Amino acid sequence: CRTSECCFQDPPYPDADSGSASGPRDLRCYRISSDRYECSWQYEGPTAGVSHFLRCCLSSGRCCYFAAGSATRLQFSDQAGVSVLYTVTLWVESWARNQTEKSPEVTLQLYNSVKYEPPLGDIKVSKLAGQLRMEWETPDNQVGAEVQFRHRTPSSPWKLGDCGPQDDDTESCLCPLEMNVAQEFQLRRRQLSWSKWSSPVCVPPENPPQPQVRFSVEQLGQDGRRRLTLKEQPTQLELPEGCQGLAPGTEVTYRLQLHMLSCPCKAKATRTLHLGKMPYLSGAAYNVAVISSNQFGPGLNQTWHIPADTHTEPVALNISVGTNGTTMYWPARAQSMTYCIEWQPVGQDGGLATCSLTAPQDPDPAGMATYSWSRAMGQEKCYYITIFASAHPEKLTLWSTVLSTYHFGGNASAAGTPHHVSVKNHSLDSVSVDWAPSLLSTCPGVLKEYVVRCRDEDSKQVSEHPVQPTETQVTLSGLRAGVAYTVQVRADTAWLRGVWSQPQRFSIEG
Amino acid sequence: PAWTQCQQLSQKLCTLAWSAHPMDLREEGDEETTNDVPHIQCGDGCDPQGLRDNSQFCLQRIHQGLIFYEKLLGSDIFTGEPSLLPDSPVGQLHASLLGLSQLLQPSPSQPWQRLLLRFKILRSLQAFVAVAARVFAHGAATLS
Amino acid sequence: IWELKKDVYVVELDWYPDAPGEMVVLTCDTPEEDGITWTLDQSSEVLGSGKTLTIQVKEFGDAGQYTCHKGGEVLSHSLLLLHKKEDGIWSTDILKDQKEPKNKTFLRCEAKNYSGRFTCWWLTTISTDLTFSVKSSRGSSDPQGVTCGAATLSAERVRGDNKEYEYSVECQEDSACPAAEESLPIEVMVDAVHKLKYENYTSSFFIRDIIKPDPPKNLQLKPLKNSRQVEVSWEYPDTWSTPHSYFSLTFCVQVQGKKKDRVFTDKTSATVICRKDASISVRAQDRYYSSSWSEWASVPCS
Amino acid sequence: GITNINCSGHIWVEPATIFKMGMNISIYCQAAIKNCQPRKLHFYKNGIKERFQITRINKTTARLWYKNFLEPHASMYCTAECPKHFQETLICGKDISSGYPPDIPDEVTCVIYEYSGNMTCTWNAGKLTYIDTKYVVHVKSLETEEEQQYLTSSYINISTDSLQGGKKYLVWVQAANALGMEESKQLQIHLDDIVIPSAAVISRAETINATVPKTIIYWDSQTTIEKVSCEMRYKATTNQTWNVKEFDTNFTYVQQSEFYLEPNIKYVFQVRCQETGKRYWQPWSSLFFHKTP
Ligand SMILES: *[C@@H]1O[C@H](CO)[C@@H](O[C@@H]2O[C@H](CO)[C@@H](O[C@@H]3O[C@H](CO)[C@@H](O)[C@H](O[C@H]4O[C@H](CO)[C@@H](O)[C@H](O)[C@@H]4O)[C@@H]3O)[C@H](O)[C@H]2NC(C)=O)[C@H](O)[C@H]1NC(C)=O
């Protein structure tokens, strides 16, 4: 009559007298939903032109049948006429090669034969009160089930346990948790037939492993940058045989956190990146931290410190000290460049660099960039100065070093005057001129050379000779005995001639 | 009335009342609210035609509702324990309500009942402050 | 046993195994008294005789269209729709559970504007012999007038091994006042009938609670010359109520492409920046009562 | 109702609404909704649904069981889901407080203060009871057997001129709350012995440059008691030890006292006194800091 309605008429084939061994067997009927039932059987022998039929007979004695065709199972709803609140008798009749083969009868109440299904893969996992807790939504129309679990580690077999009664919209199961090895967990249910074991649940360790990684940094290029590179990758976590390659949600996530130690006067100096995206760094100092995390949270992090570059470059840095403040001038690299200037007093072990940030600047008519501050670099002292710049100041990975050099603050001409200058008779025609190294010698690259002046007081003749910046002793020869002489020494810089020391008057006695 | 200030402060009132109570429980026996809570019904002249005809009828009802809701927000339901934070938005609600009522026209309960009472009062307050802010919004663009 | 409609009766049942069912008496609607015969559905076998009929309703096999005859002619009809009661909980087999925003949400109703028109959608996987019947009213102590039309089919979709059918119905409030403050809610009462199984559902709401305005209309973009900054221009949705200075809408604008842009403008225009192959997407919400957001209507950045 | 909450049942907790802190409690909600069987009960705690650990014993009543209940106060109400209604239906609620029974009070002392017309009494409280606890002070005479009872949340004073039933009295305190009550030991007092004089204050301090540097400390007390003994603590600011000396002082004039202290060291000074022979002493006076030249 219909695909889902029992026909209360005779089957269009005679009854089974053959009794062949091959045929339908194992007829079981379960209730899958609130108003849908299914019946499944197995057929023995070849399936060459075999039509199966499901037969039912109610309490009143009237018998009906379904036209299952060649399928091995059938579904119907409670309005098909098959009684669901009472006792029915179901048996399978199969027609093949012009013969009939019946099946053993099964007598049951269809509303009671319910088979419960394990959880449908969507199981939540969590850590509560020192024990692992997993929760799954209840399958539809399958409330009230005894639930039983089994678990194993990579080094242990299955262990059986119980979670307790389950009578809610969502279930739960309290399980022990391992510290460093992962676990596999499989789950099954039975109503207050036991269900088949679930798909595997895999659980990662509560504390993620420390990131076992190694880094390398390139030498500072002429563009002012150097790239960071990963030398060693993190070691893979040991997973049980049933969890290997299974459960992507149990994977450990690694994140790289960069902290620029230079330019501390900036608004933000930290940025988080993926370990697969290696960044470019300037000649500044940086701290690099790697953080491991999983579904339970972050683990122990490892941090590496990258030191600042110490190379000194001879760049035309002009510093002018005015009545209202000090101004710095240096060659600009490109248009719309934001500059960060750092200076450290020489000899101050562990002293923090003073940071100054400029607005975006374009090269001036002389091709120079400028920065001014109020009265500040202390006077008569040497400073190590490093300048960084970026066209995209918000991107820490785009900052580059402009210059790195030493500079003497204040009046270098006056403060650089050679001290403790002494003249001693060496021979009847020569003298020794010895002096203490000027303050400029403590500033690498600032002291260009010394100059010695000798004046004969009787003839008024003056002679000047240049001396290397590393020499503080010279012997002057070719002098006349009994004559008065005057000597002075000065220290010259890359841009200014120094002030002459106090004139020392002497004469050769012997 | 001062339509622009009233409109902007009623906007403040709407956003505060929706910040206070961003959930549901049904009390049996409730079939006759009647005169317990004044409401703006149809026929109080708060539709645009009612505003363009005569605003006094609508503003009278709005002021009565406002003073009722200040009396509710100032009783032991919102001052008694569990005591709310003065920095919590609830305290701001009473100040804004007092402001609106000023610019317009110059039973004891157990500690467990007060959560439910606060929720039901905020639920009614949002529904009333919506139409109040609407009628003040329409005035400041037509009846200027 | 009670009456649902003319010549249709609903029998309640306690649905547990080996139930005793209920006792049911049937009476033919005729002034005659003798020579009365009865049949069930299309079968011609006589079940009983006389003006009255007594049956014991135990299962769907005992329910169906009962007919009384006299002289070989059909006198009247009496249909029996069962109503399963499972341990005090009635059945919800017919209408599929949407489970949003909470469980057991069977009817989902929405309104585009404030004028008093709503529309309820409900989902089922049952294709044939299905017959709905919707009635509605405002309040229950002293109901007012709300009229609902016939329930038709809107769209059909396939999900999983089964199908899925979506129905809808348009209802209008008779004495609608778009500006008032609602005090007592609306009731919707659906009578789902499928062959011989009767079910019946209910939903209650405030009109201000179920408002979802239309996607914003007439989206046009004009960026600044040689600049990625684009100002967004649109108009209020057509179906929204009027005047727009009373029923005000606060908007939302995002920029999505393949870095999150979120702005809420109470004015009909705003300016953002489009990346390469991005889309400007716009929403809407009633400004004063946060009912619900609107679906995105978008055009792409080029 | 916007001003009232209607209960639709009842709720009680075992053992009681008030109980000892940290015990195991059981909350039984019995829904009494008319024309409805409760689909699901749904307990709440301060508006937060505690979903875990519920047992549906039977259709009307479900049980929620707590382990180690550590809140001083919590609002608990139980709700229900009716099959036809959409919102949860409230059944009823209760408020529960947890604390401790009171400890035994000790260290009972009482003093008359000079000119005050009062006796002040104090006693220790013990562990925190976390609930409303009340103290009852009993003052019984040894001579006329008359007892006077008094009430405080903390401490109290008794006026001197109410103790006319002789001079030998007996005082003890009683601590009371809902979870227990304990009594203190009985303290014996006599009004002559318990008098403490008026507070002594240091005025100034100067050091005299002599052959040995002498530092004099200047102080007075406004008492009228003829016989008074005192004690004073002096120490360097860098030292932790105290140095105390005894005096017999008559406060008709400002008493003077010399000290031999190390130069260029800042010292600190404090004083306490008592009626000679009496049990109680004054508290140490406020800290006076002085630095030798
Ligand atoms: C949704 O479904 C529920 C469950 O089926 C349904 O509740 C039932 O409603 C009917 C009709 O409202 C109730 O039957 C009534 O019961 C009262 C109480 O005794 C009687 O007085 C009524 O008698 C009248 O009607 C009879 C038959 O028409 C007449 O013979 C009589 O003379 C009276 O005129 C009537 O029997 C029934 O009790 C409830 N069920 C329960 C469990 O309460 C509800 O009505 C449905 N709602 C919608 C909107 O579809």
Ligand SMILES: *[C@@H]1O[C@H](CO)[C@@H](O[C@@H]2O[C@H](CO)[C@@H](O)[C@H](O)[C@H]2NC(C)=O)[C@H](O)[C@H]1NC(C)=O
């Ligand atoms: C016992 O007497 C003392 C002395 O008068 C009271 O202490 C004073 O109390 C008042 C009122 O609170 C305060 O304004 C004073 O500052 C307190 N003085 C001191 C020195 O503390 C004390 O309160 C009395 N006890 C009781 C229970 O009232």
Ligand SMILES: *[C@@H]1O[C@H](CO)[C@@H](O)[C@H](O)[C@H]1NC(C)=O
């Ligand atoms: C249901 O449970 C409560 C509490 O356990 C009990 O007092 C009662 O007798 C039970 N039965 C009924 C019908 O309430």
Ligand SMILES: *[C@@H]1O[C@H](CO)[C@@H](O)[C@H](O)[C@H]1NC(C)=O
């Ligand atoms: C005596 O005690 C009472 C309270 O107990 C207090 O009000 C009064 O001030 C006290 N007397 C003096 C002198 O402090």
